[PDB]
């Protein structure tokens, strides 16, 4: 099939989806994250160019209202066009110096990742795109001035893959365990290291939440911070890091899990920072959930291993993903200081959520970043968040 038509839906639910589409309008299946992709490294003009190749294709699409859904792995198809841009960057990496070669490879890596977005487990095109992403990321590290180690940590009769970014192997370094959202890959944050963590000599260790990316073989269960806990235990045996100076940064759902870990391992974590984290609100709102764009529902159905979806049934389960509905938030507070933030208006993460988290956290502050020039009003905040972690880790 084609990405937008992988998630088996019940006839009764397929109609609500139809209703939601013709209601939002939207000329795309996937949620385009133009700004986010630019911050992670994609050239803004190449990005528009790819979208133009995709929108201008006359090949058959699953749903013509979504120029995003061309069927088949040939021109016009999402994975295909993003992969093309990825190969272009990779091919021309073949004749650059080493610093420049790596940057072209990292950029190649990102295109491959976007090519597979939102990464549904059943998407075979997205899966080999993911292989390209991993490879390109490996090669980029070889030619980098920095140290990127791919770690394998035994777990549940299987292994967890994590990437350790070090500025150097001189003195042990404070490390920050980083995890993004359900539709990301752990390798989509090279920039968070190169332009923000590396500058302070802080090591970055990325990990995929269970059911996501390298951790897709692990089901997304009640304890979905177990992998991160396992990584925390392995720290004491990694010579390059100061396992006594561990920090946490989490994006989107990744942030929910980081708060969680911050309650389960207070003694072994210095500070936690979350951004755009969906703590409670959206989870306490089945109307909204069963309204969201189909891409997001396809993602949930995929992480939850559902065989057939009943948009109504799923809206239900989701109540569990709430940290208030789980307990972590209510009576006791964690010793771990947590800085929770998100953009003004974020539907998924209202200031009221960074609110609870800040409350149930000793020395925890909730600070909103407003829309006035989203781009400017982020790098700033993001830089504060780092100085904050530089402090708490020292």
């Amino acid at each position: 099939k084609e990405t937008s038509a992988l998630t088996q839906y019940m006839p009764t639910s397929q109609s609500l989806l139809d209703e939601i589409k013709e209601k939002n309008g939207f000329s795309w299946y996937r949620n385009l994250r133009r700004l986010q992709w630019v911050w992670q490294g994609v050239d803004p003009i190449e990005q528009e160019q790819v979208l133009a190749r995709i929108a201008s294709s006359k090949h058959s699409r699953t749903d013509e209202q979504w120029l995003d859904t061309v069927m088949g792995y040939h021109s016009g198809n999402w994975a295909y066009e993003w992969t093309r841009l990825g190969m272009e960057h990779q091919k021309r990496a073949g004749e650059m110096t080493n610093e420049a070669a790596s940057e072209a490879l990292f950029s190649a890596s990102l295109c491959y990742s976007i090519a597979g977005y939102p990464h549904l487990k059943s998407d075979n095109l997205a899966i080999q795109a993911q292989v390209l992403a991993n490879s390109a990321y490996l090669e980029a590290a070889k030619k980098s001035k920095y140290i990127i180690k791919q770690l394998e940590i035994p777990f549940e009769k299987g292994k967890i893959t994590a990437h350790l970014h070090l500025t150097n192997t001189d003195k042990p370094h404070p490390v920050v365990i980083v995890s993004a959202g359900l539709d990301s890959l752990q390798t989509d944050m090279w920039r968070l290291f190169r332009d923000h963590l590396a500058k302070h000599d802080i090591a970055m260790l990325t990990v995929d939440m269970p059911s996501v990316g390298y951790s897709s073989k692990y089901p997304l269960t009640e304890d979905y911070s177990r992998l991160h806990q396992a990584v925390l235990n392995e720290l004491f045996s990694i010579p390059y890091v100061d396992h006594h100076r561990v920090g946490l940064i989490g994006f989107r759902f990744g942030g929910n899990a980081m708060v969680r870990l911050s309650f389960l391992e207070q003694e072994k974590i210095k500070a936690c920072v979350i951004l755009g984290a969906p703590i409670h609100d959206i989870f306490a709102s089945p109307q909204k959930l069963q309204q969201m764009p189909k891409m997001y529902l396809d993602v949930l159905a995929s992480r939850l291993g559902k065989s057939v979806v009943d948009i109504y049934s799923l809206s239900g389960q989701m109540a569990a993903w709430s940290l208030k509905v789980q307990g972590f938030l209510s009576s006791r507070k964690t010793k771990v200081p947590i800085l929770a933030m998100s953009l003004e208006g974020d539907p998924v993460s209202p200031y009221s959520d960074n609110q609870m988290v800040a409350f149930f956290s000793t020395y925890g502050k909730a600070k909103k970043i407003s829309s006035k020039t989203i781009t400017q009003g982020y790098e700033q905040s993001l830089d504060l968040a780092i100085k904050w972690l530089e402090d708490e880790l020292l």
């Binding site: 700004l35 803004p44 528009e48 201008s56 120029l67 781009t375 400017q376």
Partner: protein
């Protein structure tokens, strides 16, 4: 002091007034935008056409001075799938300011596009010394819209 000639006729607007964050926030580059009144996009400088999107609503160009420009008709116009645009020049094409790059059906566009505002920006801001923005009414291929010093 290189003059950037209006790639299309219209009224000049601040780039930060276009209904799109990547442009408005100057992520694609810096410059101005034009409220179209005519029917064609032409090279804003003498140089080489870089890219021409497949939906025919935008193109890039590098002046022989090294300034890289990007002209994009409207906002969200990529979802019109090329409807209303006709490609004239080609990638790599050497051109003189005023040379026709694309032709467009304005009536059709003012009806189907989320917005007709057209950004014309310098994409390699890091490689230029200064940018001065002009204002007012401009006629395609004649009235300059910006002055750049590489």
């Amino acid at each position: 002091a290189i003059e950037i000639i209006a790639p299309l006729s219209g009224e000049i607007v601040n780039i930060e007034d276009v209904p799109d964050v990547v442009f408005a926030e100057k992520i694609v580059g810096d410059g101005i935008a034009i409220k179209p009144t005519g029917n064609k996009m032409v090279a804003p400088v003498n140089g080489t056409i870089g890219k021409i999107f497949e939906t025919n609503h935008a193109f890039s160009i590098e002046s022989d001075d090294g300034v890289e420009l990007f002209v994009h008709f409207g906002i969200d116009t990529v979802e019109l799938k090329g409807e209303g645009f006709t490609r004239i020049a080609e990638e790599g094409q050497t051109v003189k300011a005023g040379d026709t790059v694309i032709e467009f059906d304005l009536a059709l566009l003012e009806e189907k596009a989320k917005s007709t505002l057209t950004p014309v920006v310098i994409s390699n801001m890091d490689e230029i010394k200064e940018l001065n923005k002009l204002s007012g009414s401009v006629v395609v291929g004649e009235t300059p819209v910006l002055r750049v010093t590489k």
